[PDB]
Amino acid sequence: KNLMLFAGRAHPELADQVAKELDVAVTAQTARDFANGEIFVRFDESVRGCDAFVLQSHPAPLNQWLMEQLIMIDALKRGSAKRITAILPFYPYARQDKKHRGREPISARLVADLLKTAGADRIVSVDLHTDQIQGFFDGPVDHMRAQKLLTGYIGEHYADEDMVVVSPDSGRVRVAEKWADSLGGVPLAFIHKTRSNRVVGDVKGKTCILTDDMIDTGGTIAGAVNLLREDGAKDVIIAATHGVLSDPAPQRLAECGAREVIVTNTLPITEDKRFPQLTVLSIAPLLANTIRAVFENG
Amino acid sequence: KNLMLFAGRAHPELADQVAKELDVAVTAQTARDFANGEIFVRFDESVRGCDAFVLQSHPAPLNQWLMEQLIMIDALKRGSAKRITAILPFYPYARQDKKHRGREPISARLVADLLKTAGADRIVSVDLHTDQIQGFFDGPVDHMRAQKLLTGYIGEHYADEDMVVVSPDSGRVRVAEKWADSLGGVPLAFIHKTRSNRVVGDVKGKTCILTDDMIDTGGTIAGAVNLLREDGAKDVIIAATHGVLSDPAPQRLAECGAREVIVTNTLPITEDKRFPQLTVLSIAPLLANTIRAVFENG
Amino acid sequence: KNLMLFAGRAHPELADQVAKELDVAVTAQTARDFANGEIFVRFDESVRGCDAFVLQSHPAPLNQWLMEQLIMIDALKRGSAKRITAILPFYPYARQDKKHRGREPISARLVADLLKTAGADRIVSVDLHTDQIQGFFDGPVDHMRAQKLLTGYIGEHYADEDMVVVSPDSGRVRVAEKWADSLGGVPLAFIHKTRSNRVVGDVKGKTCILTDDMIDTGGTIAGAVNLLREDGAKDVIIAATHGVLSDPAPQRLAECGAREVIVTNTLPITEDKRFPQLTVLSIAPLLANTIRAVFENG
Amino acid sequence: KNLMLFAGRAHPELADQVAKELDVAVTAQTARDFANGEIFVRFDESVRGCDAFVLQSHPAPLNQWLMEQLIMIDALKRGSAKRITAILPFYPYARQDKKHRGREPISARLVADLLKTAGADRIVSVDLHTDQIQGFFDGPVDHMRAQKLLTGYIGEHYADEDMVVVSPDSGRVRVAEKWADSLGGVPLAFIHKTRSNRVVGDVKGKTCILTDDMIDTGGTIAGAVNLLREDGAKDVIIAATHGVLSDPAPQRLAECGAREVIVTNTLPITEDKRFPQLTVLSIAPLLANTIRAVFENG
Amino acid sequence: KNLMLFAGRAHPELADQVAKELDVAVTAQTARDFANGEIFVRFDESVRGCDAFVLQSHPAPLNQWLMEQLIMIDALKRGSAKRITAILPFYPYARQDKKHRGREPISARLVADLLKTAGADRIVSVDLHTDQIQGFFDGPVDHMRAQKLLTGYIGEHYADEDMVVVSPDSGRVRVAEKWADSLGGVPLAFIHKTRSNRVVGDVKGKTCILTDDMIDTGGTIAGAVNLLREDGAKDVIIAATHGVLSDPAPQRLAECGAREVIVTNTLPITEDKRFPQLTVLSIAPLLANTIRAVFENG
Amino acid sequence: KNLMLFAGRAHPELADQVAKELDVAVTAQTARDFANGEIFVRFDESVRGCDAFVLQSHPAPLNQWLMEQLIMIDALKRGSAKRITAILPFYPYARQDKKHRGREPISARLVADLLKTAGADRIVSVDLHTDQIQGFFDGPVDHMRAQKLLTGYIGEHYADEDMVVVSPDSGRVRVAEKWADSLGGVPLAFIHKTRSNRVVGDVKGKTCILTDDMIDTGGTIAGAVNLLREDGAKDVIIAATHGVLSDPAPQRLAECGAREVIVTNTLPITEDKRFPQLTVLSIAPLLANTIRAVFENG
Incomplete structure (x- = not known):
């Protein structure tokens, strides 16, 4: 068993604070944008066999950071990570958790499905807009308060x-x-x-x-x-x-x-x-x- | 059978030109951003039972327009559209179609999986970076030249x-x-x-x-x-x-x-x-x- | 001492404005092109013993106007002008003032040498791309800001x-x-x-x-x-x-x-x-x- | 001793014919125009220590090609070429080789001075308008008939x-x-x-x-x-x-x-x-x- | 009344253009030169009783074309033409319309007299050198502008x-x-x-x-x-x-x-x-x- | 009474031979052609009151020389010459002295009329094509054999x-x-x-x-x-x-x-x-x- 912590670029102070508490360095990676907006991700050390925790916060502009997290999870899945947990301290699209009047999406459910499809085995979040979002993911969801x-x-x-x-x-x-x-x-x-x-x-x-x-x-x-x-x-x-x-x-x-x-x-x-x-x-x-x-x- | 054409906001002139050639109107919808960056989508007429074509181009900033397309597809799936075809004239992440000797994602494959999970039955694209991208989607892919x-x-x-x-x-x-x-x-x-x-x-x-x-x-x-x-x-x-x-x-x-x-x-x-x-x-x-x-x- | 103002054809409004401020007419001259592109220049009044100011701006197509200015300076030198000042409000080739890591010309320095060889005793210019261009000419250079x-x-x-x-x-x-x-x-x-x-x-x-x-x-x-x-x-x-x-x-x-x-x-x-x-x-x-x-x- | 042949863009067929007779390739170089009209020149292989022959014809528009030749000669001089010969099959401004009863330039003499200042050690030309143009340059002039x-x-x-x-x-x-x-x-x-x-x-x-x-x-x-x-x-x-x-x-x-x-x-x-x-x-x-x-x- | 259009050889394109605008054919005639320079003229259809318009332009060599017009007019006069109008789009000798302080001819007046003696009843011309030339002919002169x-x-x-x-x-x-x-x-x-x-x-x-x-x-x-x-x-x-x-x-x-x-x-x-x-x-x-x-x- | 001899440019040897026999110099004049073909004539001494003899031969190109003679006669008429005799050793258009088949001019008669209109009082000629040409002129005609x-x-x-x-x-x-x-x-x-x-x-x-x-x-x-x-x-x-x-x-x-x-x-x-x-x-x-x-x- 080997704990590896990965972090996106959105909220570097949080990643550093978490890494310090665990006494584990953030795993080295190249993360950069083409002028296009396409994100490039590459891990700069081995990830085979690890228990991976992929930490991404989702401030404005939010969709970019959500794609970065999904891309990192894809890479860990193809790099033979044993277990992948996505950590989303603020769960994106949590406010869109029902149809309201209608002809609307349930975007909070779509986010969970996309994380599952990317390869995530677990989701960790803090203070979901509704507690029922915990049921949107087919797998463990640790809902921290x-x-x-x-x-x-x-x-x-x-x-x-x-x-x-x-x-x-x-x-x-x-x-x-x-x-x-x-x-x-x-x-x-x-x-x-x-x-x-x-x-x-x-x-x-x-x-x-x-x-x-x-x-x-x-x-x-x-x-x-x-x-x-x-x-x-x-x-x-x-x-x-x-x-x-x-x-x-x-x-x-x-x-x-x-x-x-x-x-x-x-x-x-x-x-x-x-x-x-x-x-x-x-x-x-x-x-x-x-x-x-x-x-x-x- | 009922043809309905939906368009995202990224490339309005293309959507208008396509609509004119088909002699159909673009379906009315509210598409707007919270200050957050979260996208809100709502269809302003019925979409039950339609053959839907969701047209979205992917210029900078690209990840926003990819999420908008996925959100629209989720909404059509929950609104009982019969068939959903995604049209992506420029296929996002097409350049990342292999690992380039590790430890990378295959982002072009992830895009196809996310479109499938959102509810797309077909993908239409123009001049893919590689023809093999056609095999990334579990379903029909019309590759136009x-x-x-x-x-x-x-x-x-x-x-x-x-x-x-x-x-x-x-x-x-x-x-x-x-x-x-x-x-x-x-x-x-x-x-x-x-x-x-x-x-x-x-x-x-x-x-x-x-x-x-x-x-x-x-x-x-x-x-x-x-x-x-x-x-x-x-x-x-x-x-x-x-x-x-x-x-x-x-x-x-x-x-x-x-x-x-x-x-x-x-x-x-x-x-x-x-x-x-x-x-x-x-x-x-x-x-x-x-x-x-x-x-x-x- | 006798002040005479000569102007090329590139920017007649500026020449007319400058002439009005000084209360001196522009000196009469024939300036015309053979079909070839060769420029013909002739002064239609005496220039012997004058303090000459040769005003030429350098819009597109620029090399033509540079040659017209050099030709006028040659004619003043052979017509026994006492002192010749070249005025180049926009200094041609100013951007090429160093090699940019080889194997390139220093075209801004070539321009100054060509003006010297033609017979110019002074250069007047406005907002040079770099101030060091002032050192490219072996003689007074008034660098106006x-x-x-x-x-x-x-x-x-x-x-x-x-x-x-x-x-x-x-x-x-x-x-x-x-x-x-x-x-x-x-x-x-x-x-x-x-x-x-x-x-x-x-x-x-x-x-x-x-x-x-x-x-x-x-x-x-x-x-x-x-x-x-x-x-x-x-x-x-x-x-x-x-x-x-x-x-x-x-x-x-x-x-x-x-x-x-x-x-x-x-x-x-x-x-x-x-x-x-x-x-x-x-x-x-x-x-x-x-x-x-x-x-x-x- | 190393023979290198450089050519401007004005007359590519002649350059190719001359290169074929000598069995020497034309030296690679980037030669292009800013929208301005300013010419950019860069040599794409080493020119240090060479015997350089810079071939430029002078069709309409002529002043541009004259400046391109001067710029190339400046670059060879700063790139430590050993010897530089300018070849001008049609000598520009040859018709203006005297004053024609004043007040005119002797433009043919100006051309020779500018070529000397740029760094040329020799001039080669074909059927000069007058043979006396050979005396306008302070150095060898091969006047071919x-x-x-x-x-x-x-x-x-x-x-x-x-x-x-x-x-x-x-x-x-x-x-x-x-x-x-x-x-x-x-x-x-x-x-x-x-x-x-x-x-x-x-x-x-x-x-x-x-x-x-x-x-x-x-x-x-x-x-x-x-x-x-x-x-x-x-x-x-x-x-x-x-x-x-x-x-x-x-x-x-x-x-x-x-x-x-x-x-x-x-x-x-x-x-x-x-x-x-x-x-x-x-x-x-x-x-x-x-x-x-x-x-x-x- | 019968309109007949005659033309000399000096300017055949003008004669054809005029004929087209009138919808009449040019009258057939043999017009040729003896080696001497003497002009031979013969009409190849009847001209009795016609209203004749004799069109001749006067380019170099001018005196030949003036004689040809006079000869044609003589022939129409002896062939019983009813009315003869001479059309001289460029009036020959128009510049010599006064003595310029002696001892010179008034050649423009001589031309009008010779046309009168040959048998012309009217002269038509375009933009005479001076308007007073209209008074040189004893009869109608239509001066076109x-x-x-x-x-x-x-x-x-x-x-x-x-x-x-x-x-x-x-x-x-x-x-x-x-x-x-x-x-x-x-x-x-x-x-x-x-x-x-x-x-x-x-x-x-x-x-x-x-x-x-x-x-x-x-x-x-x-x-x-x-x-x-x-x-x-x-x-x-x-x-x-x-x-x-x-x-x-x-x-x-x-x-x-x-x-x-x-x-x-x-x-x-x-x-x-x-x-x-x-x-x-x-x-x-x-x-x-x-x-x-x-x-x-x- | 004052004898003055004038000569056109067509046959200078004859004019000189005649002048020598009479012991009278040919009267000075400027006689020149515009590029047009128009002839310019000016007498460079007084002609008032003279008995004028205007000698012109008529080689190829013949119409030019005929106009020159008519122009000289006009000038003498306006310069107050007392008597004007035209000498035409070879009478131009003498072969066209009748209509032949017809619809032709009688050009020999037109020449006599033009000389009369110009101001000639007498015609002198040698060996006319037909003796009856003597009757074409309203005045004395000396027909020399x-x-x-x-x-x-x-x-x-x-x-x-x-x-x-x-x-x-x-x-x-x-x-x-x-x-x-x-x-x-x-x-x-x-x-x-x-x-x-x-x-x-x-x-x-x-x-x-x-x-x-x-x-x-x-x-x-x-x-x-x-x-x-x-x-x-x-x-x-x-x-x-x-x-x-x-x-x-x-x-x-x-x-x-x-x-x-x-x-x-x-x-x-x-x-x-x-x-x-x-x-x-x-x-x-x-x-x-x-x-x-x-x-x-x-």
Whole structure:
């Protein structure tokens, strides 16, 4: 048994942090783009017989990084790797996990099928948009949660406060309920959208923990902060696993009232996306523990 | 039986030309990008029971357009399309059709597998880098040739000349041999590369038809023009199916001695890629005839 | 002392502008071509004892105009002109000022020798491709700069903007640095080419001043515009001294994103080379001042 | 000692003929134009230590080819060629070899100076407009004559005839006298122009050999044919070394009464300049012998 | 009433063109020369009672064609022609229309008297050197103008240009004034000769229409082109009714800078007089309309 | 009264001989041709009040010399000459003195009318083709005869011989009869042509004097010599006033049997027309006597 770690080019800090935790160097490779956009991949040491972990994050532009991961998995399959696990800290197309009105694809299911066809035996991901995505892949899917990590941090710094957990929309109330339990059985509230916006529950004078899976443009979340403010909240804290933080989100979030915005580094948080209220916690130790347990295999 | 033509956003002029030749409208759809880079696709009329032809060209950035095509195919499969044919005028990753002595992927094979998994029943392509790519897909693959189109044009305008067909490298000599036959049994030459460059055959005082499958950066082809020039060629004409024309190729080709450069519009030839010696012929009539024959059991 | 101004046929508007600033008529001469291409030159008034300034621009076809200037200088030398200054607003063959790793001519040095052999005592030029070309001639070389003229214009119209000076390649960074100083000590960036293209420096949200010595086909410069666009530039302004503007450059520049393209009239900017974003500033006042100072001779 | 033959692009057939006679390949080189008109030259094999012969003919457009020859000589000088001979079968600007009563250049003398400055050690030319041009260059000038070649041909085909040698103007009478001696001491006549035209000498019933150095537009020579016709000449034969043959000369000469027009191939005689009475003799054997003798150097 | 068209031998293409426009055949006749030079004329069908039009152009040698016309008129007078009109598209001896300060003939008047004595009742001519020649003949003289024809052609092809009409000498300014009016009221200039040459008026940057009644040797007109060129004219177009084009005029005009030379076919333009800038318009339709009106009492 | 002698350029020896006999210089004039063929005439001393004699011979090309004479007469008429006599030693168009079949001119009458219209008061000619031409001119016509001159010479050298006068055709028998009387009443013969040739009269063993007005091509006269030879003539002598001697006549007459050919110099007998049997007698003394008698005027 031989553990080998491979990494795409999208998020080099995460790869380096994971490699350090495991005490294993990232496997040498040439990874480059033709002017075309076609990706070229070549492994610069032997991969025959290894237990391979292929780590790729999927920031913008996302389709390029998804193809790079599939190409690496093809190469390991043709190079006689024994077992291939794909690690996708942010699962691409997770939001497209059903048809909605219809005549649509289920893109999250297509991603799992493509990873299977490329040669992946296992998928590891963090905080899927829905837990049912775990059933999209014909094989083991380790669905890691950042909840303990995020609530542990919030518990260390806001234990003194009078807390209410708030879900920014109706889809996320169940997870919010899990957080409220983790924070000592505090109350719960959420934003009801009629197709107007209303807060359902009492937040007056309370420290609100606004929890979401991801922050993309910051529209929904900034709207929620302003609503909670209007309803007499003392404080608002934003916590999410994935900081996609596109477009005006950094500016939007810095200018909204929130005291703190807490994210993990499943995606690379570049200097353009940073702002003073932003705190980034590392997902690396969680990823390293999962790789170790998969590799140890009992 | 109902013919429906779907098109991605990469090359709208080709889609419009094909639609005109068939006398059918392109099917209405919403195709847009989240800031993330994730593609959203929705069909705005019914697609149940149709014979679908999904046309997507693959210019830079290529991996985005490949995912868009796969997503459209997933949607047609879940929308109960009867038969799905993928049309890829320029086949992405065609150059990566073997390992080149390890440890590499066979990306051209991966593309065919991903198209199969998405739900494609047939692939149609024009002038594959190698003919053996036809065997990469478990199903019908119509491999269309632009040879008649390109040699017909050269025959109209250079019948008066004393011609030699020249292959810019050892890989393309067989196709070059076919062109020489089409042009009335004229002589043949090619550039031999030792790992220096040498012309093998007599070109002195002749009008050279330099033929390639594609022009990417123009490095190999410009080198060949200069070599033929040094060996006393009266003129040089460049003909290729695919104008990828990345980077300095336009400057490079315009500045090299070539009298004419002839390409098809399998890829969109934007105004940045244009130059005075450049001629673009339409591949649309050929694509329309192939679709009609596939559709009509012709 | 008697000032006489002679002009070739290549760029009559510049000659007329310079003549007007000096209040001196252009000296009468017969300048015509045999069918052969041989140039015939004859002066139609006396030139004995004059301080002669021979003005010739060098647009396409360039070698003809170079020979016309050499022939005029020979005639002035045999007609007993006292002092002969050659004015070459765009110095022909300036790009060929070194060997580029053999086996090449140094054509810029050949031009200076030929002008010396013909009888020229001085050379006047505007924004040489490299400053070292001044050492190629055994005698005075007045190297005039359009920098103040171009940055003055940019200062009047874009002072409100948040500027970065950008060099389109590694060769021009020093001149770009001079411009940044002229524009109030603004930041600096340049395009790095690995032998892929990358912008080095931050341009996100800034108004980019892309500076080059000349624009020929517009390939490199259009490429740089697109790269800056991709990196989140608000605006791009193109500024260059010499508008050679051959081939597709007018169409290429008009359809790239640039808000303005600023050149001088060292070369004639014909109506085929014009487009809406194009601004042409006159080099005539600068040339007239230099002639006056040379003529006044203290 | 190593003989190397370099050729410009103006007259490839002559270069190929000369190369064949010597049994030496033309040296490989890249010779191409920027859109500007600037010529780029590079030698593709070593030239260090060679005896170089740089062959360039000077058809329309002439100044371009003159610059190409100067540029090649500069490159050989900087590439450490041992000895450089310029071969100019038709000497450009030979007609401008004096002032013609002022204020004109002596362009033929300028050409020799420019060739010297570029690095030429020798000049080889064929039938200079005046023999004194040999003194314009500070160094060896081999002035080759086509007289034996042309009178040899006329002797084989018109020995039976009753011949008079006729000069089309007062400037060429001495050379005409040399021809009359070569043809067996036949009589002499010439066209006298008063500033009306008159033939001086008896041509009635005789076969006239009209001799000139070159034929350009064919105006003077066609005029002379008609004058000789009016004076009762049986036949007129035109013989000249250089067939410049611009404009209407081919049509003019074909429709004037002349039975034959004999030229050499010092200039390229393209298919547009051909007509039935035209005979072209090769100058190549003469050029190859001269190169060999210069190279052998005793 | 019976229309009969007779033609001399000088200009057969004009006679055929006129005959076609009228839909009449040229009357059969024997016209031949004794070795002496005496002309023999005989009509080979009846001419009694006809309205005769005797068409003769007067190229070199001119006195022969004048006698032929007089002889034909004598024969028609003795053959009982009812009315005889002489058509002389180029009026011979028109330049000798006054004594020029003695002791000279008035040859233009003599020509009219000789035509009257031979039996002519009318004279028709095109663009007489002076309009007063109309008074030299005791009878009707239809003086036709080619102005509309020449300015119509110039208007079609140079309407886009910024025009000035230029007279090559002081004698033609009035006609030049008429042309400027026809061309839309454009400015006027002319060449002043002191007995030096000077342009009077502004031509700088303008397209000059140099207009004359005839071009003979091309001396005056070539001089004018060079003068306009020296005064900064963008271009020069030459237009004249009569192309006499003797001697070196073709060489002279082709070598001067003029972009176009436009003439009519009042004289036969043989292949020796042709050159590339030369355009010939037919005077036949104008002649046919005049004959029809004279014949029809129109 | 003041005698002035003017001469055209056709026959300068005759003019000089006549001038010498009269002791009067030929009046100075400029007489030249434009390339056109138009003649320019100017008198270089005063002609007012003179008795003018305008001497012109009319060799080939004849119409030019006829126009020159008419132009000179016009000039004398406008220069106030008192009396103008035209001298035409050979009267042009004399052979066309009637219509023959018809639809012909009477060109001899047209010549007289043109001379009258030009301003001539008198015509002097030698040996008109028919004596009735004297009635074609409305005024004095001095018709001079060379008969005494020619028979006087024949009497000096052939008195010893047994003579018969022979007319070469039926038209000339009367003049031949006059000669026979002048030679002492010798017999007469002539050639009868049937429309075959026959001699009518006895010439056997006799010295034949073949007499004609002129010799043109020599066809008729050579035919007559051969016929007389066949009929047993001892000798044949040819005598004619006018030696036109065109074409092969010199060769024809030299090769026919004739012992002597006697002509006058009414036309210039150039060296091409000379042969050994040819004798030329001067008409000058006869012309000088006629001028003197006209001038003396009683």
